[PDB]
């Protein structure tokens, strides 16, 4: 039961279900203590059973319980657990993650097979703690806090922080991903080259593997953090190490479109 920024309150349906259960239980106890006739007691016991049923699994037997003034059924615990929007599929088998971004993609014909063009601002945001450590190491900022305050304001950013960032990403790789991920080649590791602008530059030879084209497609970027993660990305999921299809054994990174035409 939280207060929104404007002072209003937002609550879960479970609170209303629990309130109904408690109210009916208390009224049943009061009615039992008064020696009420058996018809009234039978009604109250039926209502308590329906309240428990609605709390555990609403919309299963009879008409689902709704809040007055709306036709929306209240969300029970079973609804919380199950379904495509339920806990298992939405928060356990898949999560939202930090150190990630997204942008429009543009062809990168001058790139090598293992490289991708990453925007400077995106890279600064993605590698921010590493940049703070490197800036502390150099003389750009006396400490991590001052470095963070410096990087907060755009007009307070200078030339040497870009060189520090270029030193931060040396040798590291990032993960590029295009939805829908139909096979394992929908995620691939690339060495980032820092570019100007706000578009990710993609090698032409991986577009088929991604099923990607350049009429508005967007791709997501993720940063593996630890030494194990970086080693796995550089050795196993690097684009230049994945040249044959795991399904058929045929080459998957191969000339297409303009290259075939010219040859």
């Amino acid at each position: 039961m939280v207060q929104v920024d404007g002072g209003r309150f937002a609550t879960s349906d479970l609170n209303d279900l629990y309130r109904r259960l408690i109210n009916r239980n208390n009224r049943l106890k009061k009615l039992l203590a008064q020696g009420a006739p058996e018809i009234i007691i039978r009604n109250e016991k039926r209502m308590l059973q329906e309240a428990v049923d609605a709390l555990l699994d609403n919309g299963r037997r009879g008409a689902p319980v709704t809040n007055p003034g709306s036709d929306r059924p209240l969300r029970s615990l079973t609804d919380i657990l199950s379904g495509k929007q339920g806990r298992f599929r939405q928060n356990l088998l898949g999560k939202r993650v930090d150190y990630s971004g997204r942008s429009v993609i543009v062809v990168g014909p001058q790139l090598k097979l293992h490289q991708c063009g990453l925007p400077k601002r995106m890279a600064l945001e993605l590698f921010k703690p590493f940049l703070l450590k490197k800036m502390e190491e150099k003389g750009i900022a006396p400490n991590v806090k001052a470095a963070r305050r410096m990087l907060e304001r755009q007009r307070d950013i200078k030339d040497e922080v870009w060189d520090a960032l270029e030193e931060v990403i040396h040798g590291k790789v990032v993960l590029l991903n295009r939805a829908p991920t139909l096979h394992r080649l929908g995620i691939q590791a690339f060495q980032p080259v820092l570019v100007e602008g706000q578009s990710i530059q993609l090698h032409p030879l991986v577009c088929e593997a991604f099923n990607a084209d350049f009429d508005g497609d967007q791709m997501a970027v993720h940063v593996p953090l630890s030494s194990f993660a970086q080693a796995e990305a550089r050795i196993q999921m690097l684009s230049a190490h994945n040249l044959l299809s795991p399904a058929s054994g045929e080459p998957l990174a191969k000339p297409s479109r303009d290259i075939i035409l010219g040859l």
Partner: peptide
């Protein structure tokens, strides 16, 4: 069977 209003009214 269902619709407890009908059951209570009948009783």
């Amino acid at each position: 069977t269902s619709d407890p209003v009908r059951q209570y009214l009948h009783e």
